Each structure stands twice: as structure tokens, then as C-alpha cells.
Design a protein around this ligand. Structure first.
Ligand SMILES: O=C(O)CNC(=O)Cn1ccc2ccc(Br)cc21
Ligand SMILES: O=C(O)CNC(=O)Cn1ccc2ccc(Br)cc21
Ligand SMILES: O=C(O)CNC(=O)Cn1ccc2ccc(Br)cc21
Ligand SMILES: O=C(O)CNC(=O)Cn1ccc2ccc(Br)cc21
Ligand code: NA
Ligand code: NA
Ligand code: NA
Ligand code: NA
Ligand code: NA
Ligand code: NA
Ligand code: NA
Ligand code: NA
Lengths: 380, 380, 380, 380
């Protein structure tokens, strides 16, 4: 019925054979055949299918109201699988500030295979309509984006994509299936870095893909079986286990996000704050129309580089590390850690100022996270 | 010094920190930074590098006398990584009977990205010289091949490749590093389905790549980090553990192979036998010059389909399943299980007769495997 | 600072060496010594100590405000370890309705070693004072108990134990460290079946023990090293990971418990309800004085056996299985599943009527659990 | 049929449900019941039984020609389980130089429960007959023993035990089921530290017990379920996997043992050598009559402490660590590492001289182990 219930009882995460209430870990590569071609339960070679991976795939399919799930060895492997639906000469539109790893994959790997890529500001959907070429076959959207959390209208992107015969894809990592279901809004394919919120415990690198399209599912399965970026059984198990608490975690993260944003907007040592919950944020109405909660990623400006470094070292409960979506709260400085190769004045142009801090809110006590960040800001 | 010693003491498979005599399993995605950019031991994000994966990579690099190792989520992911060294318009030569999954990847995935592929009979190396085009950039060789175990001269293929500016690649799965070291013979890149002999226990799907070329290594690392077909830490650990016994396993397998081949050549219900140890086999001299042992895969002809099915069901110690390189002995019928989509008369043309049986010799008692197969053959 | 924060940042659950933000899994048995007696980081043999087990032990010690943690292969192994602090001729007081496995261990195993055991109603602490013999050395208390949730005054039990020179022990499984800290109230030793709430995901059988007493800790360590009921590294890792969400899980469980109890008290097909939150419950004041939340175990009477079976099969979100403390809600009938060997009229005497149902509330949506149970009750 | 075959095909180590050729890892604690009391495949709570543990138990039972297997969290937990077959006032005979952990368990833990223990020189079996008291109920034998490898006649010990109504137990760790089967010679119970050869890779701490006695099996199962020293599923899986190569490993170890002993007997810097293969060894005939191979543990005298330390640091392929039975060769000095608490002159009395070195032969190349040890000895 309701979401927290569905997280527990949706999908196939028990053992039909023994009744084990958790998915068995099939640390195995091949399977007995009773006769040539007779598969006991459909399995014959773990790259093609493995029952633990199948359990996690059924989970992501159920949670996104899709029909088919796919588990890859990482988020970028999921993305490469999806991009491989295209041929040389095909063209793909991506939102202009898409994830750095996504941009790198497209422009430094797939353009060598004749995939053409255009980055557009999808915050106005007519931008998409202008960028459509006769060779465009895919529209690829993150919402909200990193690290400034730009929101893209998912439903309109889906309509545009259908009208022009495009495969629509949403990287739903930041929102998770708990808050935003792109397939329900007409999108062809939804994907996730399960490395982040879904696994939720910073201990699995994994990607997940869901679709309701039988033909797209068949092509994805062919690509996964032929290029082989499959998730292993132990990581699939840890993913299923982590997803059990997704709702509780995201709701705690959201309570802290609201309180932390109040604090940041009030504080003198903080200028601009980037988050879709702020009513002045571009397309705040749109986000509210397509999601019923918020991501735990916030960005905000302090004065300069050394204020940011001071902030990092003054906090007791914000940890300096890569990734987002941990049980710990994480802090980072994009201009030094993710956008450092970009020349400084294009960084400034894009809003990636030297004092832009990104935090990924964890599940610590709300008041502790507010107080710790505020006392650290008070030293600036 | 000697090979069985090197299998135990070569590579980094202990913990410098605690002294643990086995590699710790780093079931983790990200890493604390003491300062922005200060990595404690070089780690920052598990897709880029993970210390358990690093342990297995150092093992494959050491065992092939290379400098750089790479661990992928499967053999075909290793192969796709290597093929992605090429650009649209580039051309690759493969041996004509290359692994079905390899052929499928190249002709149904990578040709859509403008990679051109030509299959040649590399058992005569001048075939390679004839097939070279101005656009050829890669030469890809399995030796010996599946399921008829054709041998290709590795050293001459390396010389040819160097003279024409080609990246040379050997799929060394069937021989393993214990018996055949392509990098020692001038090959640029060696790869493995570690799913088979290296893991050795039918419980990991994985690929491994080694090279001595710094620039090729840098490009492989970039491709692995951007397309993300990485092996997880638990599977890397199981790989290291399985490789410990590789020498003992391969030597037992070889003792049984010699005895089983004597039996098969003597038996009336058996026609042709395919294995590089037979002195009448094409390029037997070449194989002996480039390897100091044998693969555990044998193929042999019985009369027809139902003799093969009878054989399978009469044996007590040969198991009907996909894959090769298990501790169990495995039996299969290519014409029904791996070449069934090919029309019957091209199957016959290629030697894939309806009675061609393939066995992958395991580590059971030699006399038991000889006796069990012979008594099963005696029922034909 | 606050509890949800302490769950994330308390204890040692990162890797000092690589910075890995999760505890490495040391799947290892022994450790290199640089010189005879020189242990690099204190490890020499995994039974004596293993760094993953050490991580989980530091977690349980921190969460109970103790000094020493111990991880055993199960709850009953923790209990046997603690009972082995005694010698033949020593006497132990346990609360009269203690866990069936505990009772069985004491009366069918340890009495054969000359341990004498007396069961008393500890809901009145003067019962303890009456039962003290000159040979009594241990007082062992669960609060609240299974399946009728009797509450025992922990602080008074501690005072009594200190005055008469007894080792006081509390089985704190049902409350978890999130809600009840016996060591803070003077108890010598606190233990847990981490199989239940702490692991929280029905995928680890494990026990945990914490103490602040150096001498008791030394004796426990000696017993653990000599009788060897240690938890393995993979299970220790899964325990640490599960404990991360303990607070969020228990708080969701508590919201549903309050609402479900309102429903049960209102429903006509339900007679008595057993839970310490009910103000009419014996020692409700005491529980509130020693805990700041509630267990997720509830018991309640329906009419008879077949009403209970009907109830079980009418619910969609209550699962029929052993154990408690899962993410799923669990349902059971003690008179058939845990007290079936007791004659029927002593069952009735004790309150274990044929219609007594026990539910362990999970983390599903509150309204779904209320509605599902109520609609199932409405069919009676 | 033959032993290497039985290691691969004996026991239940595949999945009946999916056909998976390796045992699934049931990382689970409890199991769905279709009706109260209806267990789908006999499982209801993982402490009582877990299907991965059941797989390893069936393996040890098959390999020792027993009927019932039991897997414990360590060797000493197996031993404590077996000792708990006794009651206060019962008396147990152990061989005089039994494992230090065994001696410590008996004399410092179980004597506090009224178990009486007598150490006798079982190398003459009439010693056993002299030590029998009216209260003796158990006879516990290691053969060969640590670190001087004394041999005890197993068959005569069994006859003696049966005639006087004693439960006979053999710690068969050093020989493994591959070479010595005590149950075949009349022994009631056989046990193993699977931490050593059976797991074989220094990455599992575990114990295994096998018996053919239904009543003893029922009592062991009751003790295991009530005191809870169970092996977890991941460790059970790693045990099954390690046992696959037991025969190949032990045979390599034995080839190196023979050659190393020739070297040691010839070398001037080496005095006495302790190993049952030497024809001058006490009860060499007896060992040959009850085993068809040898343990990989050897002890030998060098001059003094600093010759032993020099030896350790001169070898390249002998590793300084606790335990025995690794793939690596291990070296140790009992007088400093296992017998250091014993006063020096009783050490000398027992033969534990300051220059007594113990090596556990691994699976490195034979000639490398001979040459490395000899060149290290040549520096003395
Ligand atoms: N969307 C929903 O919440 C309803 N819904 C859709 C599929 C499904 C599976 C299990 C459960 Br429980 C609820 C489900
Ligand atoms: N080729 C060899 O056999 C020699 N060799 C080369 C590298 C290396 C590492 C460890 C050991 Br041990 C031996 C090694
Ligand atoms: N009790 C508390 O809540 C305070 N407290 C006590 C130990 C400790 C460790 C980490 C953190 Br964060 C808080 C801690
Ligand atoms: N002793 C033996 O070697 C014969 N034996 C006894 C049990 C058993 C199981 C499988 C196989 Br294969 C052989 C077996
Ligand atoms: Na939505
Ligand atoms: Na649709
Ligand atoms: Na070679
Ligand atoms: Na070279
Ligand atoms: Na408390
Ligand atoms: Na105290
Ligand atoms: Na024997
Ligand atoms: Na017998």
C-alpha cells in the first residue's frame, strides 16, 4: 500500500525453496542442467542471470513501477549500457550540468564511437525542442543536478521525447524511488547510482536501471550480457539489504535538510543557498509537482577557499570524503574536488565559486547537524 | 623462484597494516581525506580504485610478468574494455573461431560503433599479414581456441603486430598464466575470463587484464573508470584465494588430460580427438614452443546426437553445465549448447558435428575420470 | 551528542590505514609478526582477536556506555559465556519467565556442571532478596520479558546485587541500547541477542556483551578465547552496518506500536493486551523511569487457537516466522511455537492462552500495519 | 570412488532448487512457515540449522565416513561442545602433550565445573588402561601431537574405550580426513580445527565434528543449539570451497615434507628431527597402519634461541605467524610462542629446547622450500 510498506514487501527478496526471509547469496557462476536445455529455475550462467542479482533487479523494477530491472557494476556502467542503445551518428541531449562522470563518458569515450552529444539548459524545456536534430535519438536528464540542484520538468521532457521519437532517460539518483518516479511520468528508462542513497551505507559501488518497455528491456539485457558490466551477488545482496531502510533514511535526511536550510539562510557567513525546497529556486513549483520530498544534497556559498577549508575542519559531524547518500553527513568543495580541471573563470561563470560548499545530509540527529554546522560557520 | 612458489608469494596479498596474511575485503565505496586532496594510501572512490581489487590486479600483473593489472566484472567486460581502445573506423583482426561471446560483442555491439572486424585463420600467421588493412589497429588472438583447440603462433603474431603498428591482445583463458605468458613473447595485452581456471571454483564471474605498456595501461584505467565494469571486493578476494591453488589444480588436470586422451584415442566409439598435446595436431610444435603445459579442455567426436546424450547420462563424474575450469569435470555438446543458432550444414562444415563432445577436465582422481568416461563410452 | 548521532559516529567503524569509511572485513585467521612477539597492531590469531570483530565490540561498548565489548556466535553463546563466570556449587537467580533458550541452557546444560538455578518473580525486587542463598553469585534479568513483557526494576536489582556481592546481568535485547542502558544504572554486565534488533535485518545470528568492569572483562575474554564461541568477521561487519539504522528503525517501530496498541485496546475480538506502554501494566512507572522508549514486541489475546490461525492467515503484512526485531512485522502463537512442550493447564496458568498472539512490529507504514491487523481481526 | 573424486562429489554442495554448482550462502536468521509447524525444507531458525552450515556438515560427515556433521565457530568450540557431553564428577583422559588450547580449556574452565582431567602418555596404550578410574567417561586423543608429533594407536584406543564404556574422541586436525579416518577404526567422535588444513587458506576460524552414533549426535546437536557456538554461513561456504582442494594440497605438502626431512637429517646445524615418517620415530609402524600419508608439521632442533631467530630471518619462503595448514609455509619457535609460560627447565625436560623450530609445510615448490631452508641453515 504505502511507500514504507512497499519497501519491505515489494519485490522478491525471500527464498521460495527454504523460506529464508532474506535473499540467498548465490556466489556461483554456472548451474546444473537436468537435460541439455532444461534449466531448473531459468538459470544457466551467472553473467546472463544470477538469482541474487535477479532479486535486486525485481526490487528496483517494483520501486520505480517498471517491469524490468538491471543491476550493473557501477552507476557509470548503467549509463554506458543505456548509451549503447545508440549507434554511431546518433545524437543525445543531456542537461548542461550533468554529472562529471557522465560528461566524461560521453565526450571522451562515446564520441570516439561516433555518438554526438549536446549539453542544453533543460530548466526551460523548449531548449530541448531547439536542440533536437534529425539524428537525435536520446534525451538524458538528471533532476535535480549536481552541485547547484537545477530542476528539469520530467513530464514535459517525456512528452517532448515521445513526440520526436526519442528514448527518454532520467538519472534519478538524487531523489531515489522513494520521492520521484520518472516512469510514472512517461519516461522510457530510469537509472540510479545505487552507490549513493539506495545502498545507503557507503559499501557498494553499483548501478540500477528500470524500464516498462519490453523492447528496450530486451536490448538492455543483450547489451548487459555482451559487455558484461554486471553486479556481483554479494553486492546485490548488500543493495537489497540497504534499500530496506531507504524510506526511514530519506525521511530523517529530509527533516534535517529543512532545518539546516533555515539555519543557512539566516547565517551571516553564508550567501547563496542552492536547494529545490527554497521557494525562490528556479522550477520549485515543477519539482513539487513531480516529487513528494527532497534530495539530501545542499550547496551554499561561503566567502572563499579558506573559509571553506576552515568550515570543513571546524565541523565535528561533517566528514570530508567523495560520494553522497551515506549514513554519515559528507562535505566537499566542488571547485577543488570535482571541478578543479575547469579554468577558474569558467568556474566562476558557472557558479562554482571557490567558497561553494556541498553537503550531503546524513542520518545524524537533526539538531546536532544544525548546531555543528552553525558553530563551525560562526568561526568565519 | 619456481611457479608454485610465485603463486603463493608473488603479488601483494597480505595486509601491511595489521599483518593479516590474507587480503582484507574492503566492502566500501569512499574514503576519508585528511585534507582536500590528501589520500592516506591513494584511495578516494572505490570505482577508481579499491584495495581488494588492487590486490588481485597486482596478482595478475605479477603472474603474467606485466606491470599493470585490471579487474573487470566479467571476461566480456575485460574484452569490451580492451576493444574500447579503438575508435570508429578502426579495424580489428580476430581468429576465425574466437569465443562466441567475443564474436557477438564485436559484430552485434561494436560494429554499431563503427568498429570493423575480420575473422581470419590465424593458424597460418601469413593470413594475418594478408588481412591487414590501412585501418587495422588491433590483433586479437585466442590460443588454443574453443571448441577445436586451434593453436596460433603467439611470438610471430607479436612480431607481425609490432611491424604493422597493431595492439596485440591474447585471450589466455584456456592456458592460464601457469603455462603460457603472452607478454613474455612480445604481446601488448593479455586477458582472462577469471570465471574459468583462475577463480577455479565456479563461484566468481570476473575478467582480468595485464600489460607492461604504461600508455596502454593509462588508457585502460581511463576506460575502466569511465565505463565502470569493475570487479567488486568480495569477488576480487575469492579470485586471489582461488589463484593460490592454480598450479596444483592445473597439474592434476594435466595428468588426467594425458590419460583421458590415451583412452579416447584407443576407444572404438570415438573418432577424432581435438587437443594440442596430440602430435598430429596442427601447430603442436608451436604450442610446445610457447607453453609448458596444456589446457584441460578436450573435444572428441562420437557417432551422433543421441550417442552424445547417452554419454552424458552414463557418466557419474562428468557434470552437464556451462563454463569450463571448475574443480568438477564438465561435459557439453557445442552443436546444441553453444553453436545451435548456426545452420546445421555450416556446423558440419566447421567440424561442429552433432556428436562433438567437449569436456573440461576437473581435479577428480585421474583413474576415476578415465574409467568413468570409458565405461560410459562402452555403452554406445 | 544525541543518540542518532552517536549511532553514526561512536565506536571505531572506519579504517585508519586506507581511510575507508566502513570497517574492512578481515576474512583471515592469522597475522604476520615482524619479530617473535611483535604484533603490528595487536593481532596474532583471529580467535583471540579479529579487527572486524573488534570494530563491532567497540560499537556495543560505546552504545551501552561500557568499556569492553565482546561478540559471540549467537545470543545463547553470549549467555553461556557469562554463565561460565560461575563455578560448580554457585547459584544464579533468573526472572521466572526468562527466554526459553536461556532456561534450557541453565537447567539442562549448566546444572549438569553443578550450577544451581532459581526462577523468581523479579517484578517485586524483594523476591530477589528472599531467594538469595549463601552460594548465589549471579543475578540475571530480562526486562521486559517474553511474551508477556514483565518489567523488572533495573536500578534496584543493581543495588541488591552490589549489596550481596552478586554479578548483575541484564539481557537488554528487547529494549536495545537505543532506549535502555543497564550499565548506566549500576549493572555489571549487559548482553544482547544481536540476532534481533541490533542486526535488524534477519540475516545475522550473533550475541553481544558489554561491561565497564576490567576484571569481569578479563574473565570474559579468557572464556571467549578458551571456549571459542566467537562471531566471524562477515557477521561482525553486517552487525555494524545494521546498527547504523537502529535509531531510525526503533523510532518507526515505536510510532507503529503506539497506534497498534490503541487499535487493539479498542477492538472487540481482542481481550488482554501486554505491553509496558499501557498505564495499567505492572511497573509501567518503573519502565518509564529506566527507558525512554518501548520494545516492538506486543502480545494480545484472541478467543482461541483457530481465531489466532485465522488472524495469521488474514493479515497481508504480518509474516509467520521465528525471531523478533526484523524490518518485517512478525507474528506468532507462543502456545504452539515456543511453549508447546508445557502442559496445557500450566500454559493457561501462566497466561499463555491458546489465543495469545505475539507480534514483533517492523518498519512498514504505521497506518498499513494498523489497518491490516484491524481488518484481519474484523474477520473473527 | 577414490579420494580426490570423493572430495569433489561427496556431500551435498550444490543447490537442488536453482542447480547452482556451489552451495548458496544463506546469510539469514529465520524462515517463513507456510503453517504453524510446516517447515518448507526443515529450516526455522539459523542457530538450530542453516543450509550453508548443513552443506559443510554433510561434507565433514562424508569425508570421515560418519553420519552426522557439526560446524562450530572454532576448533576450541568444537572441543568444548564435545567435553560438554560430560557431567560434574566425570573424568577424561587426554594425551599428555595435547594442544595448549585444549589443555587450557580443560584445566582452567571445565575443572571449575567439576570435570576431572588426567594427562597420560598414550604412546603406550596400557597407560590408558592404568589411568582409567570408575568415573572416567571420555578418552581424548590427538595423533600426531604438537609439536613433537607423538603417535597414538587409534584402533587400540578405540577397543580400550569400548571395553570400559568410554566415549572415544580423536582430534584429527593434523592428519585431515584425507589421510586418517578415526571413525573407520572404532572411534566414537572425530573433530578438527578446520582453521588449519581443511579451510586451508588462513581465512576461516572454524571447528568440525563428525560421528556415526545417533545418540551422541542428538546430544551434540542439543549442546550446539543450547550453547550456540555455531559457524556462520559465510565461513561455512569458505570451508566447503577450501576443502575442494584438500587432496591436491596435502599431496604437494607431503612431497615437500619427504624432501625437507632428507635435507634436515643431512644438515650439520640440525640435531633431532620429529616427524612420524622417520622410521626411528616411536610408533612409526602404528602411524603407517592407521594413516596413508603424513602431516605437514615438522619440528627440528637447532643450537639455541638465536640460531632459531637467525633461521627465521634468513628464509625467504617461511613466514613467521601463528597457526598451521596454510598455503604458505609457516615457521615458529614453540619455546617462545606457545610454551613460554612453562619454566625453562620443564621445557627442556619435555624436549621443547630453545632451538626447537616448528615448520608447517605449505604448497610452494618443493625444491624452493628445500633450498631456501637449507641456505638459511647454512648461515648458522
Ligand atoms: N505504488 C504503491 O505503493 C502500490 N504498489 C505498487 C506495486 C506494489 C508492490 C507491493 C506493495 Br506493498 C505495494 C505496491
Ligand atoms: N617468473 C618467476 O618465476 C620469477 N619471478 C618473477 C617475479 C616474481 C615474483 C615472486 C616470485 Br616468488 C618469483 C617471481
Ligand atoms: N551518551 C551520549 O550520547 C554521549 N556520548 C557518550 C559517548 C559518545 C561517543 C560518541 C558520541 Br557522537 C556521543 C557519545
Ligand atoms: N570412501 C570412499 O572413497 C568411497 N565413498 C564413500 C562415500 C562416498 C561418497 C562419494 C564418493 Br565419490 C565416494 C564415497
Ligand atoms: Na514522481
Ligand atoms: Na510509458
Ligand atoms: Na609462455
Ligand atoms: Na613488450
Ligand atoms: Na537507561
Ligand atoms: Na558500575
Ligand atoms: Na584411517
Ligand atoms: Na562405531
Amino acid at each position: 500500500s504505502n511507500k514504507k510498506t512497499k519497501l519491505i514487501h515489494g519485490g522478491h527478496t525471500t527464498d521460495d525453496y527454504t523460506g529464508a526471509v532474506t535473499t540467498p547469496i548465490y556466489q556461483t557462476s554456472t548451474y546444473l542442467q537436468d537435460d541439455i536445455g532444461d534449466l531448473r529455475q531459468g538459470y544457466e550462467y551467472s553473467r546472463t542471470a544470477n538469482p541474487t542479482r535477479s532479486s535486486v533487479e525485481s526490487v528496483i523494477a517494483t520501486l520505480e513501477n517498471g517491469k524490468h530491472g538491471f543491476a550493473f557494476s557501477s552507476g557509470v556502467a548503467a549509463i554506458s549500457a543505456v548509451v549503447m542503445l545508440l549507434d554511431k551518428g546518433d545524437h543525445i541531449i543531456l542537461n548542461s550540468d550533468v554529472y562529471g562522470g557522465t560528461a566524461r563518458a560521453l565526450t571522451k569515450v562515446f564520441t570516439r564511437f561516433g555518438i554526438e552529444v549536446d549539453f542544453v539548459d533543460t530548466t526551460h524545456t523548449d531548449s530541448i525542442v531547439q536542440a533536437i536534430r534529425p539524428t537525435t535519438k536520446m534525451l538524458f536528464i538528471e533532476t535535480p543536478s549536481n552541485p547547484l540542484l537545477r530542476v528539469t520538468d520530467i513530464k514535459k521532457s517525456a512528452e517532448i521525447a515521445k513526440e520526436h521519437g526519442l528514448i527518454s532517460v532520467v538519472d534519478n539518483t538524487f531523489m531515489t524511488p522513494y520521492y520521484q518516479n520518472p516512469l510514472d511520468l512517461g519516461i522510457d528508462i530510469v537509472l540510479h547510482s545505487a552507490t549513493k542513497y539506495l545502498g545507503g551505507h557507503s559499501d557498494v559501488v553499483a548501478g540500477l536501471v528500470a524500464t516498462s518497455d519490453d523492447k528496450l528491456a530486451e536490448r538492455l539485457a543483450f547489451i548487459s550480457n555482451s559487455t558484461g558490466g554486471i553486479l556481483g551477488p554479494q553486492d546485490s545482496y548488500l543493495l537489497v539489504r540497504g534499500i530496506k531502510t531507504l524510506g526511514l533514511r530519506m525521511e530523517q535526511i529530509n527533516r534535517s535538510v529543512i532545518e539546516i536550510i533555515k539555519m543557512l539562510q539566516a547565517h551571516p557567513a553564508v550567501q547563496q543557498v542552492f536547494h529545490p525546497s527554497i521557494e525562490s529556486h528556479l522550477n520549485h513549483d515543477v519539482h513539487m509537482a513531480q516529487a513528494d520530498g527532497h534530495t539530501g544534497v545542499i550547496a551554499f556559498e561561503v566567502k572563499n577557499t579558506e573559509s571553506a577549508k576552515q568550515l570543513i575542519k571546524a565541523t565535528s559531524y561533517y566528514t570530508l570524503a567523495e560520494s553522497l547518500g551515506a549514513v554519515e553527513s559528507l562535505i566537499s568543495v566542488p571547485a577543488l574536488m570535482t571541478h578543479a580541471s575547469i579554468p577558474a573563470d569558467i568556474r566562476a561563470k558557472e557558479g562554482i565559486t571557490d567558497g561553494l560548499v556541498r553537503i550531503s545530509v546524513g542520518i545524524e540527529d537533526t539538531e546536532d547537524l544544525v548546531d555543528d554546522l552553525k558553530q563551525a560557520l560562526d568561526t568565519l
